[PDB]
Write an enzyme that holds these catalytic residues in place. Structure first.
Site, mmCIF file in Angstrom:
data_model
loop_
_atom_site.group_PDB
_atom_site.id
_atom_site.type_symbol
_atom_site.label_atom_id
_atom_site.label_comp_id
_atom_site.label_asym_id
_atom_site.label_seq_id
_atom_site.Cartn_x
_atom_site.Cartn_y
_atom_site.Cartn_z
ATOM 1 N N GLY A 293 37.230 38.205 36.279
ATOM 2 C CA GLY A 293 36.802 36.949 36.725
ATOM 3 C C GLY A 293 35.548 36.570 36.282
ATOM 4 N N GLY B 165 43.857 37.442 42.357
ATOM 5 C CA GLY B 165 44.955 37.201 41.342
ATOM 6 C C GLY B 165 45.030 35.760 40.821
ATOM 7 N N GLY B 166 43.887 35.017 40.960
ATOM 8 C CA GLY B 166 43.494 33.742 40.308
ATOM 9 C C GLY B 166 43.476 33.970 38.709
ATOM 10 N N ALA C 265 36.958 37.327 44.045
ATOM 11 C CA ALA C 265 37.953 37.035 45.143
ATOM 12 C C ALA C 265 38.388 35.462 45.020
ATOM 13 C CB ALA C 265 37.802 37.558 46.469
ATOM 14 N N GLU D 86 43.827 45.439 39.848
ATOM 15 C CA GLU D 86 42.561 45.207 40.834
ATOM 16 C C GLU D 86 43.019 45.932 42.211
ATOM 17 O OE1 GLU D 86 42.545 40.842 40.447
ATOM 18 O OE2 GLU D 86 40.442 40.832 39.687
ATOM 19 N N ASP E 91 34.207 43.543 42.451
ATOM 20 C CA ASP E 91 35.085 42.452 42.032
ATOM 21 C C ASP E 91 35.085 41.180 42.808
ATOM 22 O OD1 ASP E 91 37.586 41.182 40.628
ATOM 23 O OD2 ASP E 91 38.763 42.831 41.448
#
Ligand SMILES: O=C(CO)[C@H](O)[C@H](O)COP(=O)(O)O
Ligand SMILES: O=C(CO)[C@H](O)[C@H](O)COP(=O)(O)O
Ligand SMILES: [Cl-]
Ligand SMILES: [Cl-]
Lengths: 220, 217
Positions: free
Chosen positions: A31, A97-98, A85, A105, A83
């Protein structure tokens, strides 16, 4: 507004990087917020013995900065996984999961001793659900699973032109009441054809680093 | 001998194709004899759905058009084999690697008929190693979680499933509660599908005996 948010993302990512104290196997998320972490990792090159990546996107970025990326099967166990979110509630339970990497992940989180989540304030909520829940499904089962999600009261929307790293497709599910993330994550895992769902609650984040609107750090 | 019993079971199952239906077709050698028999029910079969590219190939070779499950919708009847079948019509499947799509087909089917010969009938599932389809990246992690449960996982080399995944065949599992363990294995991160078909078991099991009779369980 987007330049402002980018500043908070960089602050959160930079703060998380300070936790790289010893020689470790580092796991890297996916991301835009993680993108600022990857850039920061140049300043911790001697501490990072092995890197594991949750996505080909991040792998591409890591390799471009000279980092060797090692498969999780040869790396073994991750010491620290960092990570982003899409949402984070009051008990450090996440929607992720966007950016489509939710399967790997979740695998990385499962194999990590410690999971640190990096967010800006816009992702902090009291109740998960407003951001649509991503669910990675076997292509053949898409219609069947869509129907099972309609029974639960959800409204599944197929994310067109998206094929995950694992060869699967994503359903983004609107209108879910997710007051019990643990229960629903367990529920969705039992639906045949579902690879992974975007709720990270059974194994939540150990630490969540949140950058506030005033550019301070809140450690939840 | 075994091939003869497989053909008997498959032929018997085909008789259940009575009306115009969406037929779902399984995978394996026992199903192979069903696919051959389907020529004699061509006018009854409106739409065919296949649980594997292997079966799809076989169906297309006999002139059958195969339709994707997303465009077919709901299957009226699904016919498939099994590696093991206990006393409550709960199965171990995945010996031929198609277990994910086989389970999806069973889930979307109004009725599931399982066709076996006697050698696959057991009192307790477990002796045949349990196939588990896993995300390649999670193989080592999942292997360790299976060791904790008392299982012994063996990576099926040179096998990549239709869905791009790998298989772990698990030995030494005590599977006296198929329902419970199927649920448990579904919660392990990186597992796509496990080979226990119990939460949604077979509705009918057609078994060919050693004496060439039919037993309907
Ligand atoms: O789970 C993820 C990718 O699937 C990301 O962590 C998240 O969805 C997006 O992060 P950002 O909003 O910072 O780009
Ligand atoms: O589950 C299967 C494929 O994954 C088969 O139905 C099972 O292995 C039985 O095959 P055969 O009839 O060839 O013994
Ligand atoms: Cl859909
Ligand atoms: Cl472990």
């Amino acid at each position: 507004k987007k330049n402002n948010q980018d500043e908070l993302k960089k602050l959160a990512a930079t703060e998380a990087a300070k936790s790289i104290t010893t020689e470790i196997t580092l796991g890297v998320g996916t991301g835009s917020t993680v993108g600022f972490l990857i850039e920061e990792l140049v300043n911790y090159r001697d501490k990072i013995k092995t890197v594991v990546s949750s996505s080909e996107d991040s792998t591409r970025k890591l390799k471009a900065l000279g980092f060797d990326v090692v498969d999780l099967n040869y790396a073994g166990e991750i010491d620290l996984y960092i990570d982003g979110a899409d949402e984070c509630n009051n008990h450090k339970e996440l929607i992720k999961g966007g950016g489509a990497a939710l399967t790997r992940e979740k695998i990385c989180v499962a194999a990590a001793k410690k999971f640190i989540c990096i967010i800006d304030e816009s992702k902090k909520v009291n109740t998960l659900g407003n951001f649509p829940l991503p669910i990675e499904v076997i292509p053949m089962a898409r219609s069947y699973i869509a129907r099972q999600i309609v029974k639960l009261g959800g409204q599944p929307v197929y994310r067109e032109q998206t094929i995950t790293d694992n060869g699967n497709v994503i359903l983004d599910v609107y209108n879910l009441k997710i007051d019990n993330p643990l229960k629903l994550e367990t529920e969705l895992n039992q639906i045949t054809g579902v690879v992974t769902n975007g709720i990270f609650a059974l194994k939540p984040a150990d630490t969540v680093i949140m950058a506030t609107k005033d550019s301070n750090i809140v450690v939840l």
